Symmetry: C3
Subunit: 397 residues, 3 copies
């Protein structure tokens, strides 16, 4: 991985710095590194591809070194350098794709393609150079058994889940009480409804609760918490739990009462916020618990009184809700988020080359399936595959 | 462009590295580059501005070289260096603004200001240095006729469009069937409504479809697809198609049935997803097609039955919807997105200096107008102008 | 600050570049810088911690220099280098945390911990090196009394505010007119309602207005403006202004008429947009003013006519709204946003070590409280603290 990264890094720097007119002193060290790369590769043969429709490609290295005697580089110097650069870029791109389309239940963190396995040999170690990207830094820190951390914008931590739970129901579904929600990506919306508006409830208050267990701990999370669940604030016709019929939801929204959000880690409360809407920080957690209540308004104007009778039929359904969004966070495991193209790169290369479903990843690299059962093997393979996607993106986008 | 970029890059590195106390070995190469820049500029005169209220400014270069003999830089060394740096920064900033406020139907990708045209001369090529930003890398790759790729967070690909299409309507607008939507930025929300709840429809199912044609292909897109269109889930009074009257929309939402999203490229299905909500990958597409149905519930509790009579008046309007958001994607053409300040920089400089409307860009650099008719000339000019904005932002924010 | 940053930068580069196999020429300059750091620190003793539960830690420097004679670095070279690196990383991390948990009403921009105060001494200035991060660049520019600019994605500029204003009301709350809104983070949603649907209003039009005053000027803002306020498009039971009772809101949405958004700076209109939805640029402003109207539909189909009678009771409440979101912007003052982890880092370190509430920051570093009363002292302390968090994140995430 580090050598593959170094190949890419060497090529990116070469492409960027070996430009017409530049002082040789601006590239002297890079030329040394570039030539070290040529010397190390020269004489070797590699073959990539062959899985799915990823073409079999042969690579042969017999390049001359780059000159070291111009004061300022001229166009001919730059152009001959690019001939070599373009070939190596094509090679790196193919090694990356070959590596990205493979997986292993047994040793997922290890190189899977022939070329990466070959590049992991001790004779290729002299190419190693400036491992500075966040992904390679993390790869290296992991390897030395140290603490790794990936920063995400809208971390895709919640597998898609949209459902409800009726805590009080009856065949006619005319006097229900329960919750409905949508957990997806970095967002949670949950509504608690009570068709009776807590008419016979103790203290005329109905308690609700929504618990979400993350598959990985998130640290240093910046979160937006807002009252109301807009998604569950409109009239709906929903399928019954058994799928046998449909019920009617006609919500009228009240402010959630006694809101308490707890960010827990291994059952322990790490952060707790009582009725605080806006931006809050959750520093270390693997579980979110949202508790909120519907309290029947003790004083009601006529228009309100008319919505909540003492007896059925209950035609306006009292609803309270919350919306929680994780804007950014750090995770020790790789994850998909709203900004990085890694998942999309890996998924795209596999799709383009008709790569057959393997033993590790769910069909289509489906994110929900992946995060729902995020096993150690899937994570090691995902990290390997995400790191390669990031090496490839330094040169090919 | 590359020389202008190099000027900015040289100045940014100088400002960052030529700091008090630093080992001379930390800046030796930079000093060489800095001095190459001074030597190349010395003796030249440039003039910027004069368009709109952008002031006419004269620049004269007659600077001494930076010394090369301190072991660790002292405060006096740093301060005399900054006198030169600040002047060059002011110059670069003015060249950038002068370039950003100009456009050309004929040769939009080429330098438009006198200073950039002057800097494109062969005598200024020795300043060229470390072209490493994503924008200049792309500029250079484009120039060598190679594949460029810009990565965006929430790519602003959809011109604002908010409308409806009544597939079945009548003067009273009491039994409509059709769709309404909002395409804007990176998001699409579309709802299909049938006032009759498919009472007389074959298989009691009404089919809907929404097609969106992108003005540019997006690759490696990470997308969130969710059922329901919250934006079209509430009661509305809308203007009729002919503007002569207003109709009433009183939606009740049902789950979209047989959801199928197709990401097509030149008429070919590249990706297709059947009822998959959550995160999905669209690898290469220029068109999105959302197909969904409203199926009359075969089994209805009384409360539901009451909403859907066998005869008019139809007072509750059955509605199904979808929401699609492009979180990130790569595009071969520059675009505005939710994170980059390029469009805002260009638009801001033009607005501040009262730059008159030109022959290429729509008044006010209006994004919707621009993307709606994204001609080759507008793109070449936009890219030139975005690349300059990015050169300027290395020094002036 | 600059020396602390330089320590971190030196360590990050060392960790990244001093890798097995690398050409010595790839690290020669860094080794010089690394050794300059060792020489400068050697002989010194520092102590960190002791506030709250941040442990008291002692640091002693007596390290040998790194060798300068290998052609390509070997594993033993890399491993002995890491022993020194890991210790310095641990030291930098502790200095950062000690600094991040402190504050001062008097001189908030100045170092507060013993270690940072010690590192600000002239004898430690030789460590200074390549101050290139956006935060340190800004710190340095501020210091030279120059223009600083931080770029944010979804700048968290609006303190949480969710409320309403009844311009016409009566005890029964059966014929209200006013506005309700939610200002939070980078978003504003505001709705204007008129239970009478402007039946007795001049020109059958009711005017609305929403003004939001930013605590800091935002420049180069890319904004999404859309008609309708989904958050206020559903039925609600709300508490009365005096808290004595509850009123009923049963909205029916109409298109906002004569929409005018003004971005003002010190009372002056800098940007104005008339009914333009989609993406707009606001280049320099400290205030946003949204003006919109509800115009009674001059022509109504029966279904619409039935919602708006000539006399009470008014059962369907005409509502018009707007949604405005600041996607990105530049601010001269540090702020929390949807991507940076600074606020979360500072807040997290203080929470983890049970740091007592101080004299500057609100309890829990509460963002709303902070931005609501963003005094000069809070900003100077926030900037110091955010810059340290950013120095720490180069090594520890
Ligand atoms: Ca062969
Ligand atoms: Ca990231
Ligand atoms: Ca309703
Ligand atoms: Ca756990
Ligand atoms: Ca792991
Ligand atoms: Ca002149
Ligand atoms: Ca971007
Ligand atoms: Ca096409
Ligand atoms: Ca193009
Ligand atoms: Ca002591
Ligand atoms: Ca930022
Ligand atoms: Ca002001
Ligand atoms: Ca300030
Ligand atoms: Cl976002
Ligand atoms: Zn975002």
């Amino acid at each position: 991985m580090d050598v593959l990264y170094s190949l890419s890094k060497t090529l990116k720097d070469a492409r960027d710095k070996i430009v017409e007119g530049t002082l040789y002193s601006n590239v002297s060290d890079l030329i040394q590194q570039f030539n070290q790369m040529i010397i190390t590769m020269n004489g070797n043969e590699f073959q990539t591809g062959g899985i799915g429709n990823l073409p079999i490609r042969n690579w042969n290295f017999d390049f001359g070194l780059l000159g070291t005697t111009l004061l300022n580089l001229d166009a001919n110097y730059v152009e001959t350098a690019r001939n070599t650069i373009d070939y190596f870029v094509d090679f790196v791109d193919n090694v990356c794709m070959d590596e990205m389309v493979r997986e292993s239940q047994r040793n997922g963190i290890a190189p899977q393609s022939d070329s990466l396995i070959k590049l992991s040999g001790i004779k290729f170690k002299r190419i190693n150079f400036d491992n500075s990207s966040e992904y390679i830094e993390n790869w290296n820190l992991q390897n030395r058994r140290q603490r790794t951390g990936f920063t995400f914008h809208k971390p895709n931590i919640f597998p898609y889940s949209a459902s409800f739970t009726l805590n009080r129901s009856q065949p006619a579904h005319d006097n229900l009480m329960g919750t409905m929600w949508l957990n997806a990506g970095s967002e949670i919306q949950v509504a608690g409804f009570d068709y009776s508006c807590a008419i016979n409830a103790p203290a005329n208050t109905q308690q609700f609760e929504h618990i979400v267990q993350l598959r990985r701990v998130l640290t240093t999370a910046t979160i937006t918490l807002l009252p109301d669940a807009e998604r569950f604030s409109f009239p709906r016709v929903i399928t019954s739990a058994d799928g046998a019929t449909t019920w009617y939801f006609n919500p009228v929204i009240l402010r959630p009462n006694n809101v308490e959000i707890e960010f827990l880690l291994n059952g322990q409360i790490i952060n707790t916020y009582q009725a605080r809407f806006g931006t809050i920080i959750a520093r270390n957690f693997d579980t979110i618990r949202l508790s909120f209540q519907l309290m029947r308004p003790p004083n009601m104007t006529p228009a309100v009184a008319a919505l909540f009778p003492n007896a059925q039929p209950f035609e306006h359904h009292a609803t309270v809700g919350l919306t929680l969004r994780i804007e950014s966070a750090v995770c020790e495991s790789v994850l998909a988020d709203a900004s990085e193209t890694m998942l999309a790169n890996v998924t795209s290369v596999r799709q383009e080359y008709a790569i057959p479903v393997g033993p590790v990843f769910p069909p289509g690299m489906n994110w929900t399936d992946l995060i729902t059962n995020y096993s150690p093997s899937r994570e090691d393979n995902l990290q390997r595959v995400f790191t390669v996607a990031s090496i490839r993106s330094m040169l090919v986008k």
